[PDB]
RNA sequence: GCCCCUAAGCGUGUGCUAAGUGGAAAAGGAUGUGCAGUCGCGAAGACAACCAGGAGGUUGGCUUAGAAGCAGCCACCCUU
């Protein structure tokens, strides 16, 4: 990819679904991607639009004054807060004289330069060749200043010219083995990625996977419940791929803690079928923990945003993820003040701050009810000579207290089924 | 063989004592019996024990000691401590037994030489950071 | 790419002193 | 046999080798044994 | 303090150029020149090995008494030339001096101390100008920084001279300086 | 990142690499150094990378000084647009280092793990490099 | 250029080469040999090997399902 000058920006929208309320969010949401990506907000304005014109986007006179507020400005940037077309932009870009991009090319330039392994830069590197393949024919400068670029000539019998497919359709033949052969590539780790956790539900162990919109948890809750220490941050979109670690209760089982890329609404429909690593993780879990911000304009929004995605996603793997259990973090930040609005119909709401915060022990007493369904449930009686009745009784994962009697000793605790099934002798 | 030093004020509440007695083919009651009497009505310290089960399954234990590191232990010591080496000072060990010290033990892991008290008097002391004085 | 190499890469024998036209 | 041009020794135990003119390291761990090729 | 010169050979360079320093290298010696206060150009081929080993042995002050032909001649080091991708010496300067001449000297400094248990000790220049007769030439002093709180500049001021030693440099220029040792943080922030 | 705040003329000629470096042949700042052994044109990015690996070998502790600087705007040509028309815009930093340069010097207590983070930076480089020290 | 083709030497001596390198080549690694210096031991027989040496309060450390020399941890002023 290509990254140029920023820090001076414009932003331009239509305002055709939600209220003014919401085009003020979409709005405050666009610039603060363009701020993280390294962008200037200077002027952002939406048109009262029932659609988006199809020439333009905005409409001649919201083109004039974008040109004047621009030239007035020294910008050189303009934003659509949508998914424009080819024709859209080459008119808004005619109209200005100054580069033009959108949400979604917004969203992969940042994706790009936050990339960190090879898979996530592979899979960014498709999304952006997949967004750029229409402009072909659609690149106007690269099917410009073309007279004689192939041989315009026949004849019977001998020709001896040899662009026996239009230079075009070479392009798009060319373009599209590229983007077959990256397709390939990232079906092929597909089985990377499994094997890589191959050893993990093998031996089955609850699994609590993370979820939540961009800057929702940014690995900060992984941070502080697990006490592994991973890329964390208050920008948007940080951790590029996902980590599990050992947190679990007092009892041994792990409860192994999956970190979940954010989720950003109105997806520009190109990573949500190539980054299937979350998708994936999501379908696997065992248990859900979806991360809400207490003081935000609108947590319903990203809140149901976060249901659809996930709704869509099972539909389509045919499964059934029952629990499904909301938190609103970032409490502690007592940046909202509609703490009862949101408990008054929304329960399990503990506080943590953006960064940090504790509270947490009434979020995992009521997490463990939903994942702590084990079905060991027996006990023993354990002889004078012990010896090598520890293996799996007590050194094991969950593994309880119990009283102590002269003949051994009486263990009420559970023991794990596969593990010690009929090993134990009443 | 097995020799322990944790809290030995004990009536077979743990796994240490309580199948210890009763495995190994052992008197379900009388070395509990003799070491409730001996050591427990010696005020119960610190006594750690060697197990060397003969054919007739007795073994006499003696007034063992702690190192020279941890003698208040015995001597009026509370359990507590430290586990990093060159901690805060936890509590003192006063020139009472100062002799006594050397009269538990005297040998090494290996046949290397004698004098185990002028071994302990630094050895195992600097390991947590308890202090004599 | 065997062609070139070998074409450059033959002026160094003692007879051409490292010189050798197109090359 | 995790083969490349490049090989080092992982633990203290493995000893590299010239062995039939070819270069290997062997360990007692066989998941540490290399080969150069 | 006083050192004892080491006895060292060295012959007159019959020719002169730069064919002839070549070969003379190429041989083992080196070519040097011999002046001093009496105005005495000389042109010698010393010894690479002996030189060296001197060098290291007694720092770069080190008296060398060098026989002229039968005579001995006492010179000085004042500064020597090391090729930089060989580390070789190529040639270096000797002053002819006698007993009872204050002539000035440089000198390096090291560290026997390390530092505090939660603090960073750095050298900022080893390289300072003393006043020592010909005969008796310090070297490689020490500096004290055992267990000393951070933040101070230790400059030429408060270092301990042998017998018949002055300092040249003023005593404000820095020569150590025990500063805080930073964090993770810190490390990454400086040249990022 | 380290870029020049400025350029009297933002496209240069490339720089001429012939001999050996008169300069910046010894540990000044530190006290063990990389001295390289060969023409390189050194990057931005490079020495970026150099860093971040001593500094991720370095916790708590130590000191690195940065002895090169990229301060040669190297243009390479746009896109294909066949060849002429003009010279490239600028797109890269470069620093020219000749033989015997130094590039890195650090001051680290742990002399071992020291020259082990040096040497891994050094082959994190284009070029042949030794490791010298400040002494002789 | 000098073994045959192919005219002239399977030349004379001192060393290297194990790869047919010679008779393509990089970043990198690496108990090959050829040859310079250099290290504390050290022709006391050094060193290797055969070797008696198998829980010191040694189940402590953070702790009590045991912390069972021993999952691991910050120290080894410890000797007839």
Same mark, same amino acid.
């Given at each position: ?46 048109? =009262? ?39 859209? %932009? ?59 670029? =192939? ?50 539900? =093998? ?84 248990? %859900? ?17 976060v249901r659809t995605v996930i709704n869509e996603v099972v539909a389509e793997y045919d499964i ?27 329960? /399990? ?39 090598? %009745? ?15 009697? /002269? ?20 | ?133 | 790419?065997?062609?070139? #190499?070998?074409?450059?890469? #033959? ?8 010189? #050798?036209?197109?090359? | ?37 | 303090?006083?050192?004892? +010169? ?7 360079? &019959? ?24 105005? @005495? +150009? ?24 060098? @026989? ?8 000085? &080091? ?5 090729? +930089? ?7 270096? @300067? ?24 939660? &603090? ?21 002093? &020490? ?50 | ?19 050996? $470096? ?30 971040? $690996? ?52 650090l001051s680290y207590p742990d002399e071992k793990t020291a020259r082990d983070a040096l040497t ?17």
């Amino acid at each position: 990819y290509r990254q140029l000058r920023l820090e001076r920006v414009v932003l331009v929208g239509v305002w055709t679904e939600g209220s003014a309320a919401d085009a003020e969010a979409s709005l405050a949401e666009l610039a603060a991607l363009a701020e993280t990506a390294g962008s200037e907000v200077l002027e952002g304005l939406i048109q =009262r639009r029932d659609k988006p014109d199809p020439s333009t986007y905005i409409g001649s006179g919201k083109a004039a004054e974008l040109r004047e507020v621009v030239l007035a400005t020294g910008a050189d940037t303009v934003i659509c807060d949508g998914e424009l077309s080819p024709a859209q %932009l080459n008119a808004l870009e005619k109209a200005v004289k100054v580069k033009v991009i959108d949400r979604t090319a917004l969203i992969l330039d940042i994706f790009a330069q936050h990339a960190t392994s090879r898979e996530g830069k592979a899979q960014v590197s498709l999304a952006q060749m997949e967004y750029m393949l229409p402009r072909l024919r659609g690149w106007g400068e690269s099917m410009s200043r073309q007279a004689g670029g =192939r041989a315009g000539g026949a004849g019977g019998g001998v020709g001896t010219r040899g662009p026996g497919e239009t230079k075009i359709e070479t392009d798009r033949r060319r373009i599209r083995e590229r983007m077959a052969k990256l397709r390939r590539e990232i079906r092929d780790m597909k089985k990377i990625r499994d094997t890589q956790r191959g050893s993990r539900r =093998r031996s089955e162990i609850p699994s609590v996977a993370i979820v939540g919109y961009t800057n929702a948890g940014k690995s900060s809750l992984l941070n502080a419940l697990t006490g592994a220490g991973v890329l964390v941050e208050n920008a948007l979109f940080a951790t590029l791929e996902p980590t599990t670690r050992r947190g679990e209760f007092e009892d041994g089982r792990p409860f192994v803690l999956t970190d979940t890329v954010g989720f950003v609404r109105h997806l520009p429909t190109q990573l949500v079928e190539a980054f299937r690593s979350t998708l994936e993780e999501v379908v696997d879990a065992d248990l %859900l923990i979806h991360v809400v911000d207490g003081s935000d304009v609108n947590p319903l929004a990203q809140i149901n945003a976060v249901r659809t995605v996930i709704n869509e996603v099972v539909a389509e793997y045919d499964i059934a993820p029952p629990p499904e259990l909301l938190v609103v973090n970032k409490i502690d930040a007592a940046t909202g003040v509609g703490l009862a609005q949101l408990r008054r119909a929304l329960p /399990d709401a503990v506080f943590v701050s953006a960064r940090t915060g504790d509270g947490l022990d009434k979020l995992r007493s009521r997490m463990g009810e939903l994942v702590e369904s084990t079905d060991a449930t027996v006990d023993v009686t354990i002889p004078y000579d012990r010896g090598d %009745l520890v293996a799996r009784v007590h050194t094991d994962g969950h593994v309880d207290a119990t009283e102590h009697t /002269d003949a051994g000793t009486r263990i009420k605790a559970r023991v794990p089924a596969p593990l010690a099934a009929t090993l134990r002798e009443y | 063989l097995i020799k322990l030093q944790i809290q030995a004020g004990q009536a077979n509440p743990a796994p240490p004592v309580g199948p210890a007695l009763g495995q190994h083919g052992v008197n379900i009651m009388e070395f509990c019996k003799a070491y409730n009497a001996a050591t427990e009505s010696q005020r119960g310290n610190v006594i750690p024990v060697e197990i060397t089960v003969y054919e007739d399954r007795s073994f006499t234990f003696a007034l063992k000691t702690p190192p020279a590191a941890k003698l208040l232990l015995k001597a009026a010591g509370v359990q507590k401590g430290s586990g990093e080496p060159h901690k805060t000072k936890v509590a003192k060990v006063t020139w009472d037994q100062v002799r006594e010290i050397a009269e538990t033990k005297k040998a090494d892991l290996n046949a290397n030489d004698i004098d185990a008290a002028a071994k302990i008097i630094a050895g195992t002391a600097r390991s947590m950071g308890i202090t004599v004085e | 790419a065997k062609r070139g #190499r070998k074409k450059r890469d #033959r002026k160094h024998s003692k007879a051409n002193h490292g010189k #050798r036209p197109n090359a | 046999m995790k083969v490349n041009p490049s090989v080092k020794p992982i633990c203290d135990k493995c000893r590299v080798i010239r062995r039939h003119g070819r270069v290997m390291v062997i360990c007692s761990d066989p998941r540490h044994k290399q080969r150069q090729g | 303090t006083a050192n004892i +010169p080491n006895k060292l050979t060295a012959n007159v360079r &019959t020719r002169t150029g730069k064919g002839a320093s070549r070969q003379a290298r190429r041989d083992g010696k080196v070519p040097a020149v011999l002046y001093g206060h009496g105005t @005495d +150009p000389q042109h010698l081929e010393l010894n690479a090995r002996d030189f060296a080993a001197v060098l290291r042995s007694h720092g770069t002050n080190a008296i060398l008494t060098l @026989d002229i032909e039968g005579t001995e001649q006492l010179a000085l &080091t004042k500064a020597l030339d090391v090729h +930089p991708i060989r580390r070789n010496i190529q040639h270096a @300067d000797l002053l002819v001096v006698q007993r009872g001449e204050k002539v000035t000297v440089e000198v390096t400094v090291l560290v026997e101390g390390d530092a505090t248990p939660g &603090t960073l000790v750095t050298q900022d220049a080893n390289t300072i100008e003393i006043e020592a007769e010909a005969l008796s030439i310090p070297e490689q002093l &020490t500096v004290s920084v055992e267990g000393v709180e951070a933040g101070t500049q230790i400059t030429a001021g408060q270092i301990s001279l042998p017998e018949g030693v002055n300092l040249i440099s003023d005593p404000e220029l820095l020569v150590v300086n025990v500063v805080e040792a930073p964090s993770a943080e810190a490390l990454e922030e400086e040249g990022a | 990142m380290l870029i020049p705040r400025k350029v009297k003329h933002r496209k240069q000629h490339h720089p001429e690499q012939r001999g050996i $470096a008169s300069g910046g042949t010894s540990v000044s700042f530190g006290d063990y150094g990389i001295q390289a052994l060969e023409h390189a044109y050194i990057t931005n990015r490079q020495i970026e990378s150099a860093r971040i $690996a001593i500094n991720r070998h370095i916790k708590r502790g130590g000191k690195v000084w940065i002895n090169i600087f990229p301060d040669r705007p190297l243009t390479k040509k746009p896109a294909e647009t066949r060849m002429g028309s003009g010279k490239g815009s600028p797109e890269w930093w470069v620093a020219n280092v000749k033989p015997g340069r130094v590039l890195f010097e650090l001051s680290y207590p742990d002399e071992k793990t020291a020259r082990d983070a040096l040497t891994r930076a050094i082959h994190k480089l284009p070029i042949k490099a030794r490791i010298v020290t400040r002494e002789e």
